[PDB]
Curated annotation (Swiss-Prot):
Residues shown, of full length: 152 to 201 of 802
Entry similarity comment: Belongs to the CEF1 family.
Entry's disease: A chromosomal aberration involving CDC5L is found in multicystic renal dysplasia. Translocation t(6;19)(p21;q13.1) with USF2.
Source species, domain of life: Eukaryota
Expressed in which tissues: Ubiquitously expressed in both fetal and adult tissues.
Subunit structure, as described in the record: Homodimer. Interacts with DAPK3. Component of the precatalytic, catalytic and postcatalytic spliceosome complexes. Part of a spliceosomal 'core' complex consisting of CDC5L, PLRG1, SPF27, CCAP1, CCAP3 and CCAP6. Interacts with PLRG1, Lodestar/TTF2, and NIPP1/PPP1R8. Component of the minor spliceosome, which splices U12-type introns. Within this complex, interacts with SCNM1. Component of the PRP19-CDC5L splicing complex composed of a core complex comprising a homotetramer of PRPF19, CDC5L, PLRG1 and BCAS2, and at least three less stably associated proteins CTNNBL1, CWC15 and HSPA8.
Protein known as: Cell division cycle 5-like protein
Signal peptide start-end: none
Compartmental location: Nucleus; Nucleus speckle; Cytoplasm
Free-text function comment from the UniProt entry: DNA-binding protein involved in cell cycle control. May act as a transcription activator. Plays a role in pre-mRNA splicing as core component of precatalytic, catalytic and postcatalytic spliceosomal complexes. Component of the PRP19-CDC5L complex that forms an integral part of the spliceosome and is required for activating pre-mRNA splicing. The PRP19-CDC5L complex may also play a role in the response to DNA damage (DDR). As a component of the minor spliceosome, involved in the splicing of U12-type introns in pre-mRNAs.
PTM statement from Swiss-Prot or TrEMBL: Phosphorylated on serine and threonine residues. Has no effect on subcellular location nor on homodimerization. Phosphorylated in vitro by CDK2. Phosphorylation enhances interaction with PPP1R8.
Length: 50
RNA sequence: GUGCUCGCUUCGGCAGCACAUAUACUAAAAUUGGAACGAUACAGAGAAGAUUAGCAUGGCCCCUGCGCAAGGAUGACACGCAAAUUCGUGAAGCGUU
């Protein structure tokens, strides 16, 4: 019954599931780089990026 | 530069005439930028359970190939809270002309 519910719920394949996780990881690394850049601008250190 | 001048006129010089008439992306440089795999960590291969052949499609994505062949993971990407013009009924409660 548990496998029945878990397979009646699913519609997504491999690539959609890796892209959703990749979007969450991109959001996480964006917030992390945002925090680092906000600290570098808050204390004041003008390191430029590429 | 050379030759000819019944040129001065010596073998020294000068004069005249003739022929000959415009190289070089100008550097042995100074500069200026974008770039070599590939190593560093991470990262993991589509199709509604799982294991999988693939053929396409589109373009500010390319690589290998002489290729209008064929490969590159079906080469990669594409996965979207997929909302575009324009509304009306019926009673019910409350306030108003
Ligand atoms: Mg599958
Ligand atoms: Mg092919
Ligand atoms: Mg395959
Ligand atoms: Mg293809």
């Amino acid at each position: 019954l548990s496998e029945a519910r878990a397979r009646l719920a699913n519609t997504q394949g491999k690539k959609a599931k890796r892209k959703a996780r990749e979007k969450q990881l991109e959001e996480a690394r964006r917030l992390a780089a945002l925090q680092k850049r906000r600290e570098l601008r808050a204390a004041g250190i003008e390191i430029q990026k590429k």
